[PDB]
Design a protein around this motif. Structure first.
Motif, PDB file in Angstrom:
ATOM      1  N   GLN B   7      87.985  -4.003   7.628  1.00 38.01           N
ATOM      2  CA  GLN B   7      88.122  -2.925   8.606  1.00 38.01           C
ATOM      3  C   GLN B   7      87.738  -1.578   8.011  1.00 38.01           C
ATOM      4  OE1 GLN B   7      88.186  -5.448  10.646  1.00 38.01           O
ATOM      5  NE2 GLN B   7      90.007  -5.990   9.446  1.00 38.01           N
ATOM      6  N   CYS B   8      88.200  -1.297   6.793  1.00 37.27           N
ATOM      7  CA  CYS B   8      88.046   0.014   6.179  1.00 37.27           C
ATOM      8  C   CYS B   8      86.748   0.136   5.388  1.00 37.27           C
ATOM      9  CB  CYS B   8      89.263   0.313   5.303  1.00 37.27           C
ATOM     10  SG  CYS B   8      90.800  -0.248   6.066  1.00 37.27           S
ATOM     11  N   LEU B  11      85.930   3.548   6.669  1.00 37.42           N
ATOM     12  CA  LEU B  11      86.936   4.600   6.527  1.00 37.42           C
ATOM     13  C   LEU B  11      86.331   5.840   5.882  1.00 37.42           C
ATOM     14  CD1 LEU B  11      90.603   4.363   5.809  1.00 37.42           C
ATOM     15  CD2 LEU B  11      89.292   5.566   4.064  1.00 37.42           C
ATOM     16  N   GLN B  14      84.701   7.946   8.588  1.00 37.96           N
ATOM     17  CA  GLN B  14      85.700   8.574   9.446  1.00 37.96           C
ATOM     18  C   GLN B  14      86.300   9.801   8.767  1.00 37.96           C
ATOM     19  OE1 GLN B  14      85.310   7.174  12.248  1.00 37.96           O
ATOM     20  NE2 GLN B  14      84.200   5.491  11.259  1.00 37.96           N
ATOM     21  N   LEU B  18      86.125  13.804   9.829  1.00 38.16           N
ATOM     22  CA  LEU B  18      87.273  14.703   9.939  1.00 38.16           C
ATOM     23  C   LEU B  18      87.064  15.974   9.117  1.00 38.16           C
ATOM     24  CD1 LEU B  18      88.577  12.332  11.409  1.00 38.16           C
ATOM     25  CD2 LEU B  18      90.688  12.826  10.160  1.00 38.16           C
ATOM     26  N   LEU B  21      84.481  18.183  10.819  1.00 40.13           N
ATOM     27  CA  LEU B  21      85.048  18.924  11.941  1.00 40.13           C
ATOM     28  C   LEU B  21      85.900  20.088  11.454  1.00 40.13           C
ATOM     29  CD1 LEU B  21      86.060  16.177  14.543  1.00 40.13           C
ATOM     30  CD2 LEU B  21      83.905  17.417  14.300  1.00 40.13           C
TER      31      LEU B  21
ATOM     32  N   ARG C 126     105.233   9.739  14.401  1.00 40.21           N
ATOM     33  CA  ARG C 126     105.045   8.302  14.224  1.00 40.21           C
ATOM     34  C   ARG C 126     105.615   7.522  15.403  1.00 40.21           C
ATOM     35  NH1 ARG C 126     108.252   4.769  11.476  1.00 40.21           N
ATOM     36  NH2 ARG C 126     109.082   6.292   9.981  1.00 40.21           N
TER      37      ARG C 126
ATOM     38  N   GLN D  17      97.526  13.517   7.628  1.00 40.14           N
ATOM     39  CA  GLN D  17      97.997  13.876   8.965  1.00 40.14           C
ATOM     40  C   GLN D  17      98.002  15.375   9.249  1.00 40.14           C
ATOM     41  OE1 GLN D  17     102.073  13.021  10.793  1.00 40.14           O
ATOM     42  NE2 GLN D  17     101.026  11.085  11.236  1.00 40.14           N
ATOM     43  N   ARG D  24      94.244  18.773  16.496  1.00 42.62           N
ATOM     44  CA  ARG D  24      94.693  18.406  17.834  1.00 42.62           C
ATOM     45  C   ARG D  24      95.333  19.592  18.540  1.00 42.62           C
ATOM     46  NH1 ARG D  24      99.877  16.715  19.502  1.00 42.62           N
ATOM     47  NH2 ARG D  24      99.879  15.642  21.523  1.00 42.62           N
TER      48      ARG D  24
ATOM     49  N   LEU E  42      85.055  12.825  19.890  1.00 43.79           N
ATOM     50  CA  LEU E  42      84.639  12.411  18.550  1.00 43.79           C
ATOM     51  C   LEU E  42      85.853  12.253  17.637  1.00 43.79           C
ATOM     52  CD1 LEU E  42      82.713  11.739  16.329  1.00 43.79           C
ATOM     53  CD2 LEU E  42      82.158  14.157  16.068  1.00 43.79           C
ATOM     54  N   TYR E  43      86.754  13.240  17.663  1.00 41.36           N
ATOM     55  CA  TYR E  43      87.965  13.150  16.852  1.00 41.36           C
ATOM     56  C   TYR E  43      88.791  11.926  17.232  1.00 41.36           C
ATOM     57  CZ  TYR E  43      92.909  14.120  15.861  1.00 41.36           C
ATOM     58  OH  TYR E  43      94.231  14.015  15.495  1.00 41.36           O
ATOM     59  N   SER E  46      87.357   8.804  15.735  1.00 39.78           N
ATOM     60  CA  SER E  46      87.627   8.752  14.301  1.00 39.78           C
ATOM     61  C   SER E  46      89.062   8.309  14.025  1.00 39.78           C
ATOM     62  CB  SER E  46      87.350  10.114  13.667  1.00 39.78           C
ATOM     63  OG  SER E  46      85.978  10.254  13.345  1.00 39.78           O
ATOM     64  N   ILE E  47      90.030   8.904  14.727  1.00 42.71           N
ATOM     65  CA  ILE E  47      91.431   8.563  14.479  1.00 42.71           C
ATOM     66  C   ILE E  47      91.722   7.129  14.899  1.00 42.71           C
ATOM     67  CG2 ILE E  47      93.827   9.238  14.851  1.00 42.71           C
ATOM     68  CD1 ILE E  47      91.889  11.198  13.279  1.00 42.71           C
ATOM     69  N   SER E  49      89.656   4.585  14.784  1.00 43.26           N
ATOM     70  CA  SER E  49      89.143   3.723  13.724  1.00 43.26           C
ATOM     71  C   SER E  49      90.049   3.767  12.498  1.00 43.26           C
ATOM     72  CB  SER E  49      87.716   4.130  13.358  1.00 43.26           C
ATOM     73  OG  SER E  49      87.434   3.829  12.002  1.00 43.26           O
ATOM     74  N   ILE E  50      90.501   4.966  12.115  1.00 39.45           N
ATOM     75  CA  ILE E  50      91.379   5.087  10.951  1.00 39.45           C
ATOM     76  C   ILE E  50      92.653   4.278  11.157  1.00 39.45           C
ATOM     77  CG2 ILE E  50      92.868   6.683   9.692  1.00 39.45           C
ATOM     78  CD1 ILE E  50      90.274   7.108   8.616  1.00 39.45           C
ATOM     79  N   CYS E  53      92.082   0.610  10.858  1.00 42.15           N
ATOM     80  CA  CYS E  53      91.951   0.242   9.449  1.00 42.15           C
ATOM     81  C   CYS E  53      93.311  -0.012   8.802  1.00 42.15           C
ATOM     82  CB  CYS E  53      91.206   1.348   8.695  1.00 42.15           C
ATOM     83  SG  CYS E  53      91.587   1.430   6.919  1.00 42.15           S
ATOM     84  N   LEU E  54      94.210   0.972   8.864  1.00 47.77           N
ATOM     85  CA  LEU E  54      95.468   0.881   8.140  1.00 47.77           C
ATOM     86  C   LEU E  54      96.472  -0.025   8.832  1.00 47.77           C
ATOM     87  CD1 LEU E  54      97.673   2.846   9.772  1.00 47.77           C
ATOM     88  CD2 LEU E  54      96.098   4.597   8.919  1.00 47.77           C
ATOM     89  N   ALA E  56      95.982  -3.125   9.756  1.00 51.73           N
ATOM     90  CA  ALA E  56      95.864  -4.494   9.263  1.00 51.73           C
ATOM     91  C   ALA E  56      96.773  -4.751   8.068  1.00 51.73           C
ATOM     92  CB  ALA E  56      94.412  -4.793   8.891  1.00 51.73           C
ATOM     93  N   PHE E  60     101.447   2.763  10.184  1.00 49.05           N
ATOM     94  CA  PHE E  60     101.259   4.207  10.274  1.00 49.05           C
ATOM     95  C   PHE E  60     100.418   4.497  11.509  1.00 49.05           C
ATOM     96  CE2 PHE E  60     101.748   8.115   7.651  1.00 49.05           C
ATOM     97  CZ  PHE E  60     102.900   7.760   6.980  1.00 49.05           C
ATOM     98  N   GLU E  61     100.572   5.707  12.048  1.00 47.76           N
ATOM     99  CA  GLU E  61      99.854   6.125  13.253  1.00 47.76           C
ATOM    100  C   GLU E  61      99.537   7.614  13.134  1.00 47.76           C
ATOM    101  OE1 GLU E  61      98.690   3.651  14.291  1.00 47.76           O
ATOM    102  OE2 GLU E  61      99.592   2.879  16.129  1.00 47.76           O
ATOM    103  N   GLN E  62      98.274   7.931  12.860  1.00 51.20           N
ATOM    104  CA  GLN E  62      97.824   9.313  12.924  1.00 51.20           C
ATOM    105  C   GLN E  62      97.747   9.764  14.379  1.00 51.20           C
ATOM    106  OE1 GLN E  62      96.097  11.403   9.995  1.00 51.20           O
ATOM    107  NE2 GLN E  62      94.778   9.795   9.149  1.00 51.20           N
ATOM    108  N   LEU E  63      97.854  11.070  14.585  1.00 55.45           N
ATOM    109  CA  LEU E  63      98.002  11.611  15.931  1.00 55.45           C
ATOM    110  C   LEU E  63      96.758  11.353  16.777  1.00 55.45           C
ATOM    111  CD1 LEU E  63      99.723  15.111  16.294  1.00 55.45           C
ATOM    112  CD2 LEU E  63     100.100  12.995  17.599  1.00 55.45           C
ATOM    113  N   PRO E  64      96.870  10.637  17.908  1.00 58.77           N
ATOM    114  CA  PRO E  64      95.748  10.573  18.854  1.00 58.77           C
ATOM    115  C   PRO E  64      95.805  11.695  19.880  1.00 58.77           C
ATOM    116  CG  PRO E  64      97.139   8.560  18.867  1.00 58.77           C
ATOM    117  CD  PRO E  64      97.923   9.679  18.276  1.00 58.77           C
ATOM    118  N   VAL E  65      94.861  11.702  20.819  1.00 59.18           N
ATOM    119  CA  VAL E  65      94.814  12.685  21.895  1.00 59.18           C
ATOM    120  C   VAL E  65      94.591  11.943  23.205  1.00 59.18           C
ATOM    121  CG1 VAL E  65      93.539  14.608  22.911  1.00 59.18           C
ATOM    122  CG2 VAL E  65      94.006  14.573  20.441  1.00 59.18           C
TER     123      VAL E  65
END
Lengths: 386, 49, 241, 48, 69, 48, 96, 48
Positions: B7-8, B11, B14, B18, B21, C126, D17, D24, E42-43, E46-47, E49-50, E53-54, E56, E60-65
Motif C-alpha cells: 500500500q505504502c 506514501l 502523498q 502535502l 501544498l 481520531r 497531523q 484543513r 487534492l488534499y 492524499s489523506i 491514500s495515507i 496505507c497505515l 493495513a 490512525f486517522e489523519q483529518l479528512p474533509v
C-alpha cells in the motif's frame, strides 16, 4: 527599482546571480566594500556594462580611514607617493601574515582591504580621476564579453577601487523594466558605505526592497539586521513594499536546533508572511549552472569549478557546492521524499561522490535540488506582485 | 522485512504533495515544520536501528 | 463502546488539567515569554510618558482648547492646563489599548500553538471527525478578554485628569504667573507670551503624573490581567469539557 | 520486527497531523467566507 | 448638507456600470471558490491514500474533509 | 442687518477674555478648590 | 452588562489580599491557637477554636469595611458612567 | 425627494442629540430614578 539590502556576506550578490541564473557579480568575502551594483535589461546584441571607478579623493579617504584603524605611521600623501604606497602595502602584508590570513581577523581583513585599495589605485591610476569619478565601458576598457568584465571586477583590487557597476543584459525578469540594485553590506566597515545603502533603500525611487537575512545560518539576528528592520518599519513609504528572504537555508536542513530557532523567530516577529521567503541562493545558482554541463566536463568540475577545484598541492579541492550537494543528499533529507535513492560513500572523495551521484541520476536530481532551493517561488511571487 | 507492504509504495508521493501544498500557501509557511516529518519519513523508509 | 466513553471522560479531565496548569504557570510568572511581553509593556509605557511630557508644548494645548470651543477665536490662558491634562490622559489611554491588544493576541497565539501538540487535543480528531468547539470558544474568550481589558485600561486612565495636590505645589509653579504677562506685558490677544512658562508647567506635570502612572502600572495591571485570564478561561474550559 | 517497525509509522503520523490540521482549517475558513457573499445580482447591487 | 443631498444623481450616473461591476465580482468570487475547492480535493485524495496505507498495519486517522458547507 | 449682526458678534466675543477684574484675590481666590479636594470632596461628584 | 460584571469581579477579588489592618496584634493575635493546642484541645475536633470567633469577627470588620466603603463610594459610580457614555454614543452614531 | 432626504438627515441629528442628552442627564445625576437605584445598590451592599 528592486534594491537588495542586508548584512555583508549575507548572499545578496549570490542570491541575485541565482535569480539571473548567471554568475554576474562576485561573492567575495572581505572585498565588497562600497561597490553598488545595478542590473538592467538589454537586447541580446546590446549586452553591456558600465564601470565607475572611485575618484582619487574617495580612494585617499578610505585609505586614510584604513590607515588610522591599522595604526600605521604614515602621511596623508601616501597614495600618490610610490614609496609610501609600498611601505603601507608591506605593513598591511605583515599584519595579515601575523594574523595568519586576511579573513582570520578583523584587523587582517581591514589591512587586506587597504592593501588591495592601494594596489588597485596604482594599477588603475590611469582610469582614476583626481576628484571626479571616471566612467568607462567595455569598448573603452577593451572587454570582449560580460564574463571578462565580471572577472576584471572580481579581482580584489579592481573591486576595491571600483565605485559603481551598471551591467546590462537580456533577461525576461528585467524585460518589464525592473532594475536590480545590490547594495553594500549594512554592517560593512565603511560608515559611508552603510549610509549610502541606507539612503538608497530610503530613497523614494526604490520600488521594492529585498532584505537578505543571516539567521538561517547564524541562528539569531544581528544588531545591524535589527537596526535595518526597525528603520524599514519606520519608513512609511517602503514598509509596504518590502520582501524578506532567508538565504543559506541549507544549513538548517541538517541542524535541527538552528532550524527550530529560525521557525520560532519567524513566527514571533513577522506576523505577515506573504512577503517572507526562504531560499538557498548558492545551491539554486550552482544547480542552474550545472544543468548546462555534461559528463565530458565532470558535470562542471572542469568548467564551472575549475578555479575552485585546483588545490595547491595538486589535490582536487572539493568545491563548496559539491560539499553542500553531498550534504544535501546525505543529511538534509530533502531528497528523502522523492523517487531518488541517493547513497553517499564514505570511502570516496566528495568530488567523486558527486560525479557518481549525478552520473546515476542526472538532471532530474538537479531540478529537484533547485526546487528545494526555492528561488523560483520568490522570483514568481515578486514578478506577480510587480 | 516481515511487515513489508504494498500500500505504502506511493506514501512518498502523498507526503510530497502535502509538503508542496504547504509550500504553495504563503501565509502557512509560518507554521512550516516539514522536515520533522521528513526525518520521521526517512526512518520510516529503509528503517535503521 | 464503554471503553470509548471512558476515553472521552478521561480526555475531558486531561484538557481541564492542562488549561489550569497553563493559566497557573502564567500567574506564578513561570511563563518567560509572558514576562518578556509584560516588561516590554511597562517599559513602553514609562518611555511614552517621559517622551510625551518632555516634548509637551503649550501651543498644542492652546490649539486643542481653540478646537474645543469653535465659537471663539481666543481661549483663556487657563485652558492650556486643562487641555494639557486631557491630551496626556487620552494619549496614554490609546497607548494602553494598543499594547493590550498586542499582548493578548500574542499570548493567545502562543497558547494555540503549544496546545496543538499534546496527545489530549490530538486524540480528539481520531475518534471524532472534527475539533468540537475548541477554536470557537478560544476566539470567543479572546474577544471577551480583550474587551474587558480595554475597558479596565480606559476606566483606570481617566482618573489621571483629576488634579492631584502635587499639581498645586506653589514653590514649583504658581498659577498667578499669568497676571504679569497680562498687565501690559502681553500687548495683544496672542498667547505667545505664555510660552515663557513652559518649563515650569512641564516640571509640574511631571510631579503630578509620574506617581499616578508608576502606581497604576506597577500595582494593578498585572493583577487585572491575571484575574481576567483565570476567571474567563476556566469556565470556558469547563464548558468545552 | 514486530514492535519497533510499526512505531516509526505511528510517530510519523503523529508528527504529520498538525500541518494537515492547519491546511484543513485554512481551506475551510476560506470556503465558508467565500460562500458568505450573495450570488444574485439583484441583491448584490444593493451592497454597492 | 448639499453634497449628500444629491445621492440620487450620483446613483443615476453610476447605474451605467453597476451591473458590469456586479457581474465581474460574482465571477471572481466563484473562480476563487472553485480554485480552493480543487485544492481541497487534492488534499483529500492524499489523506485518503495515507490513511489506507497505515490502516493495513496500524490504527490512525489523519483529518479528512467532507461537507465543508 | 448682516453688517450689524457681524458687528455685534465681533464685539461680544471679547467678553470671554479674562479682564484683571476677574483676578481680584480679595473677592474670590481660585485656590478655594483645594480645600474641597483635600478629603472634603470624598468622590468625583462636583456637589462640593 | 458583561463589562460591568467583569469590572465588579476584578475589583472584588482584591479583598482577599491581607491588608495590614488584618494583622493588628492588639485586637487578635494569631498565636492564640497554641493555648488550645497545648493539651486544651484534647482531640482533632475544632470545637475549641469556636471560643475565638468574636475577635476574628472584629478583625474581619476592621480589615474589610474600609475596602468596601472605598470601592463602593469611589469607583462604581464612575465606572458605570464611563461604560454607559463610552458604549452608547458610538452605537447612536452607527444607528444614525 | 430631496425634502425626504433632508428629513432623514435631520432625524439622525435629532436622535444623536437625544441620546447624548439622556446619557449626560444620567451622568450629572439629574435622573432621579437612576439615583434611587444607585442608592439602593449602595445600601444593599453595606447591609449585606
Amino acid at each position: 527599482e528592486i534594491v537588495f539590502a542586508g548584512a555583508f556576506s549575507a548572499g545578496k550578490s549570490m542570491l541575485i546571480n541565482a535569480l539571473l541564473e548567471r554568475e554576474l557579480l562576485y561573492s567575495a568575502e572581505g572585498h565588497a566594500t562600497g561597490t553598488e551594483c545595478h542590473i538592467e535589461y538589454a537586447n541580446a546584441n546590446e549586452e553591456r556594462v558600465v564601470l565607475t571607478f572611485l575618484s582619487e579623493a574617495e580612494i585617499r579617504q578610505q585609505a586614510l580611514i584604513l590607515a588610522k584603524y591599522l595604526n600605521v605611521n604614515v602621511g596623508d600623501l601616501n597614495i600618490n607617493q610610490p614609496e609610501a604606497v609600498k611601505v603601507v602595502s608591506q605593513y598591511c602584508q605583515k599584519i595579515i601574515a601575523e594574523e595568519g590570513g586576511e579573513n582570520k581577523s578583523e584587523r587582517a581583513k581591514q589591512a587586506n582591504a587597504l592593501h588591495l585599495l592601494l594596489i588597485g589605485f596604482e594599477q588603475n591610476r590611469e582610469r582614476i580621476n583626481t576628484v571626479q569619478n571616471s566612467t568607462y565601458s567595455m569598448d573603452q576598457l577593451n572587454f570582449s564579453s560580460l564574463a571578462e568584465a565580471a572577472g576584471y571586477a572580481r579581482r580584489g583590487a579592481n573591486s576595491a577601487v571600483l565605485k559603481r557597476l551598471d551591467y546590462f543584459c537580456n533577461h525576461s525578469l528585467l524585460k518589464d523594466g525592473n532594475v536590480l540594485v545590490d547594495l553594500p553590506g549594512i554592517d560593512a566597515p565603511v560608515k559611508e558605505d552603510a549610509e549610502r545603502a541606507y539612503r538608497k533603500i530610503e530613497s523614494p525611487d526604490t520600488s521594492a526592497v529585498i532584505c537578505v537575512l543571516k539567521p538561517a545560518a547564524a541562528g539569531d539576528m544581528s544588531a545591524e539586521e535589527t537596526q535595518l528592520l526597525e528603520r524599514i518599519s519606520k519608513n512609511h513609504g517602503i514598509r509596504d513594499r518590502v520582501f524578506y528572504v532567508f538565504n543559506r537555508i541549507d544549513d538548517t536542513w541538517y541542524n535541527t536546533q538552528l532550524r527550530q530557532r529560525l521557525e520560532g523567530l519567524i513566527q514571533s516577529q513577522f506576523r505577515d508572511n506573504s512577503r517572507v521567503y526562504k531560499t538557498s541562493g548558492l545551491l539554486g545558482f550552482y544547480g542552474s549552472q550545472v544543468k548546462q554541463t555534461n559528463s565530458s566536463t565532470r558535470f562542471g568540475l572542469d568548467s564551472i569549478f575549475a578555479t575552485t577545484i585546483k588545490g595547491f598541492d595538486g589535490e582536487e579541492e572539493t568545491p563548496q557546492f559539491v560539499s553542500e550537494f553531498n550534504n544535501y543528499c546525505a543529511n538534509s533529507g530533502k531528497l528523502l521524499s522523492t523517487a531518488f535513492r541517493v547513497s553517499v560513500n564514505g570511502y570516496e572523495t566528495s568530488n567523486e561522490n558527486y560525479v557518481r551521484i549525478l552520473s546515476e541520476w542526472g538532471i532530474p536530481l538537479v531540478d529537484q535540488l533547485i526546487h528545494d532551493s526555492g528561488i523560483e517561488s520568490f522570483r514568481s511571487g515578486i514578478g506577480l506582485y510587480l | 522485512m516481515s511487515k513489508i507492504a504494498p500500500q505504502c509504495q506511493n506514501l512518498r508521493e502523498q507526503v510530497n504533495q502535502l509538503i508542496e501544498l504547504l509550500r504553495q500557501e504563503p501565509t502557512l509557511r509560518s507554521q512550516q515544520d516539514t522536515s520533522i516529518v521528513e526525518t520521521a519519513l526517512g526512518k520510516a523508509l529503509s528503517p535503521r536501528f | 463502546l464503554t471503553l470509548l466513553n471512558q476515553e472521552m471522560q478521561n480526555l475531558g479531565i486531561e484538557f481541564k488539567k492542562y488549561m489550569s496548569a497553563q493559566i497557573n504557570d502564567v500567574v506564578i510568572g513561570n511563563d518567560r515569554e509572558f514576562d518578556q511581553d509584560f516588561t516590554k509593556l511597562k517599559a513602553r509605557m514609562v518611555a511614552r510618558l517621559d517622551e510625551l511630557l518632555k516634548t509637551f508644548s503649550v501651543m498644542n494645548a492652546y490649539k486643542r482648547a481653540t478646537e474645543s470651543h469653535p465659537r471663539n477665536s481666543t481661549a483663556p490662558f487657563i485652558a492650556v492646563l486643562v487641555e494639557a491634562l486631557y491630551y496626556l490622559a487620552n494619549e496614554l489611554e490609546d497607548a494602553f489599548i494598543e499594547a493590550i491588544h498586542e499582548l493578548v493576541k500574542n499570548f493567545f497565539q502562543r497558547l494555540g500553538d503549544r496546545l496543538r501538540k499534546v496527545d489530549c487535543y490530538h486524540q480528539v480528531y481520531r475518534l471524532v471527525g472534527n475539533d468540537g468547539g475548541i477554536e470557537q470558544l478560544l476566539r470567543r474568550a479572546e474577544e471577551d478578554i480583550t474587551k474587558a481589558l480595554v475597558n479596565e485600561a480606559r476606566t483606570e486612565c481617566d482618573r489621571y485628569v483629576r488634579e492631584s495636590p502635587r499639581f498645586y505645589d506653589e514653590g514649583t509653579f504658581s498659577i498667578y504667573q499669568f497676571r504679569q504677562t497680562l498687565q501690559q506685558t502681553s500687548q495683544g490677544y496672542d498667547a505667545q507670551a505664555i510660552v515663557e512658562a513652559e518649563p515650569a508647567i512641564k516640571e509640574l506635570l511631571k510631579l503630578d503624573f509620574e506617581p499616578k502612572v508608576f502606581n497604576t502600572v506597577r500595582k494593578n495591571f498585572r493583577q487585572t490581567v491575571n484575574n481576567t485570564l483565570k476567571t474567563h478561561l476556566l469556565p470556558m474550559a469547563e464548558e468545552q469539557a | 520486527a514486530e514492535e519497533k517497525y510499526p512505531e516509526l509509522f505511528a510517530t510519523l503520523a503523529n508528527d504529520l497531523q498538525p500541518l494537515c490540521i492547519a491546511l484543513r482549517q485554512f481551506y475551510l475558513e476560506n470556503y465558508r467566507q467565500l460562500d458568505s457573499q450573495p450570488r444574485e445580482i439583484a441583491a448584490m447591487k444593493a451592497q454597492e | 448638507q448639499i453634497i449628500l443631498e444629491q445621492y440620487d444623481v450620483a446613483r443615476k450616473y453610476r447605474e451605467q456600470t453597476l451591473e458590469q461591476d456586479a457581474e465581474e465580482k460574482i465571477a471572481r468570487n466563484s473562480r476563487l471558490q472553485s480554485e480552493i475547492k480543487q485544492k481541497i480535493d487534492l488534499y483529500q485524495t492524499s489523506i485518503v491514500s495515507i490513511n489506507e496505507c497505515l490502516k493495513a498495519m496500524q490504527i490512525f486517522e489523519q483529518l479528512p474533509v467532507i461537507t465543508e458547507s
